[PDB]
């Protein structure tokens, strides 16, 4: 712990170790182990002993499936649904670059956006796309290309619409100095020149750009701040709780 | 909590029904009112506990019950006050009424039977009880003494909650409202402090800033304060104060200065201004009231901006020493406490038109 990712905001003292994300759908540095979510962000748990006690009750689903692992690696666009409590979150960034506590409606919880990472011909001649959350869906629309994004159902897998990556799309920044900024595009030099709803301009690597809809028309609810906050998010959670 | 009540333009004012009632005993200390039938409670420098009902606005208050003292309690917790009870208030549920005074003993009473329910000794040589305030809707109890100490008691636990220290001068006056906090004024200190009880925090206010300011202000074209007399806390976030020099100061947590100030409220008589004897408000409203031996009830309105106040009007109905003021509605009927001699004994000259008892006032709308 100290060699953990800063954006979990674990204190310095407390112990020597941090959770260390299980293997899963999101790379370790880019994830949010449930334990940190239950106890550290949401305050439902105190102990790690109690995080577990919660999870074994099957009180928590990620993307619709009950997940029962303390250090399960949840991440960007993931849903997380605590039922006996009626809450639906979606893990999406602060403008600081912190997984924000962001309650979403009881619908919306029903879909997520995934970035396509690869699009390839699997065997038997069947094609597949691979999203950033490590989903593979076969038989996708032939128009879907690498870097496009894709509305997944969630109860069934199933892509149910997509967005191309081209000049003028609305965009989430998923890493680096600009991690959390949202904005239109402008230009792909790979680097992507982004302009936000304030005519503030900035670049990042193509790797860090995530397409989330059309200008002024995100396909998901944005956190307080419109990536121009995870703190505001935490202020509402504990206070209503 | 704040002011949602604006009737300030409604009031029956001039036509207010005014009347008096002569009473048996002398030098009436204080008056309280329980509102769920209406109830009336006064204790006397004559060593008596006295109980009436006003619950009709058509008629004068009407006798209920009394219990009188003597010397016969003299010794250390004995059931009764052989000395003068200097303040009174009753349990906000109406289940109890409590008293303290020169003998620095707490005698709380079951109202209905009107016989001692319990007694707690204050334990000091200096512990005389100057004032009493309940929190709303609670048997939490705030109490002030001249040892600079503040005492808190939850009635049904009949137990000593908490204690506070800290005014350089004696503590005359405390006000309290629904949320938990209360205010005290240190008289000759020229300061007043606020108390968040569990947090156990005090916040500080300083008035008294000299003349030769008024003069210097007004020469582009008259009194110091000796002491802070009283305080009535209007909302959570604002309140009013008064001082022997006849300055009324609304103070607000927004600044460390007074947010507004007024001079010679009840007038003067080189020369002597009137003290501001009784300062009282009705919760979360735009209106408060003061009274003094100059005998003109002065009812003031808050302006909706809450950045200044104005006179609504005057009720001559009272004359002489004004100890307390209480507003009870169902309409309004104000009950005034008038003795011929001030509470704490430094005497006020040649009271005439003097009397002792309740003063009645009937306003509506």
């Amino acid at each position: 712990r100290l060699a953990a990712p800063h954006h979990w905001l674990l204190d310095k003292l407390s112990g020597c170790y941090a959770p260390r994300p299980s293997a899963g759908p999101h790379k370790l540095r880019e994830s949010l182990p449930l334990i940190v979510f239950l106890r550290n962000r949401l305050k439902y748990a105190l102990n790690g002993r109690e995080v577990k006690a919660i999870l074994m009750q099957r009180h928590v689903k990620v993307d619709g499936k009950v997940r029962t692992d303390t250090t399960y690696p949840a991440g960007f666009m993931d849903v997380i649904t605590l039922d006996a409590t009626n809450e639906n979150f979606r893990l999406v960034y602060d403008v600081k670059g912190r997984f924000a506590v962001h309650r979403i409606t009881d619908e919306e919880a029903s879909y997520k956006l995934g970035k396509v990472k690869k699009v390839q011909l699997g065997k038997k001649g069947v094609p597949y796309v691979v999203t950033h959350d490590g989903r593979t869906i076969r038989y996708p629309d032939p128009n879907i290309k690498v870097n496009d994004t894709v509305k997944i159902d969630l109860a069934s897998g199933k892509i149910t619409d997509f967005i191309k990556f081209d000049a003028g799309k609305l965009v989430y920044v998923t890493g680096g100095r600009n991690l959390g900024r949202i904005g239109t595009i402008v230009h792909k030099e790979d680097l992507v020149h982004i302009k936000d709803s304030l005519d503030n301009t900035f670049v990042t690597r193509l790797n860090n750009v995530f397409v989330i809809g059309e200008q002024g028309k995100p396909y998901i609810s944005l956190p307080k701040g419109k990536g121009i906050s995870i703190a505001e998010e935490r202020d509402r959670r504990r206070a209503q709780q | 909590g704040r002011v949602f009540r604006y009737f300030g333009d409604k009031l029956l004012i001039s036509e207010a029904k005014q009347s008096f009632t002569r009473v048996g005993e002398n030098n009436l200390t204080c008056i309280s009112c329980f509102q769920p039938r209406l109830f009336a409670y006064t204790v006397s420098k004559d060593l008596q506990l006295t109980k009436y009902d006003i619950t009709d606005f058509s008629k004068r208050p009407k006798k209920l019950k009394y219990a009188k003292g003597g010397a016969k309690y003299i010794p250390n917790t004995t059931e009764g006050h052989y000395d003068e009870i200097l303040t009174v208030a009753a349990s906000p549920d109406g289940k109890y009424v409590v008293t303290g005074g020169r003998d620095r003993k707490l005698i709380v009473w079951s109202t209905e039977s009107l016989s001692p329910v319990k007694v707690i000794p204050t334990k000091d040589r200096r512990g005389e009880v100057l004032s009493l305030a309940f929190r709303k809707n609670s048997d939490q109890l705030y109490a002030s003494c001249a040892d600079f100490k503040i005492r808190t008691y939850s009635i049904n636990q009949f137990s000593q909650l908490e204690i506070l220290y800290g005014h350089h001068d004696i503590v005359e006056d405390i006000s309290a409202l629904a949320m938990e906090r209360c205010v005290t004024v240190g008289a000759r200190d020229r300061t007043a402090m606020l108390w968040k009880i569990p947090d156990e925090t005090r916040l500080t206010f300083r008035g008294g800033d000299e003349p030769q300011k008024l003069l210097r202000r007004w020469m582009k074209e008259f009194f110091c304060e000796g002491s802070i007399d009283v305080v009535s806390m209007v909302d959570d976030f604002h309140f009013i104060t008064g001082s022997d020099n006849g300055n009324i100061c609304l103070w607000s947590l927004a600044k460390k200065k007074p947010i507004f100030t007024e001079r010679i409220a009840h007038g003067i008589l080189l020369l002597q201004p009137f003290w501001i004897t009784s300062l009282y408000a009705i919760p979360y409203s735009n209106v408060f009231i003061s009274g003094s031996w100059s005998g003109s009830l002065k009812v003031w309105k808050i302006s909706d901006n809450l950045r200044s106040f104005e006179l609504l009007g005057e009720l001559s109905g009272a004359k002489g020493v004004v100890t307390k003021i209480q507003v009870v509605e169902s309409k309004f009927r104000i009950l005034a406490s008038i003795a011929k001699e001030h509470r704490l004994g430094r005497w006020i000259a040649n009271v005439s038109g003097a009397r002792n008892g309740i003063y009645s006032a009937v306003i509506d709308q």
Binding site: - | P211, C224, G226, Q272, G345
Partner: protein
Amino acid sequence: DAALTQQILDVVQQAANLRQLKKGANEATKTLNRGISEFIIMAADCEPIEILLHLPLLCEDKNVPYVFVPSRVALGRACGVSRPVIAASITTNDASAIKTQIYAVKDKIETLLI
């Protein structure tokens, strides 16, 4: 004046609490005769005024500072009494916790007399 009156009344109050004060025209006179008065305070609205007119004379002869405050009611309250006081004497105590405050008042009074 107003300022000096408040300064005086506050010191009188502290002197009362520390029992370093004598109240009344007669008691004041005696402190002067004994040379134990730091300064004399008198009420300007004393009625009749004649009952205390010997004090200014006595103070001048003893080189003791004296001054009048406007209200006997106020001076009475400062003395910690529920009655009006027309004369008061702050007594000597070189080890007094309020010696400096007493000296400050003396200096103010002395300046007025000059």
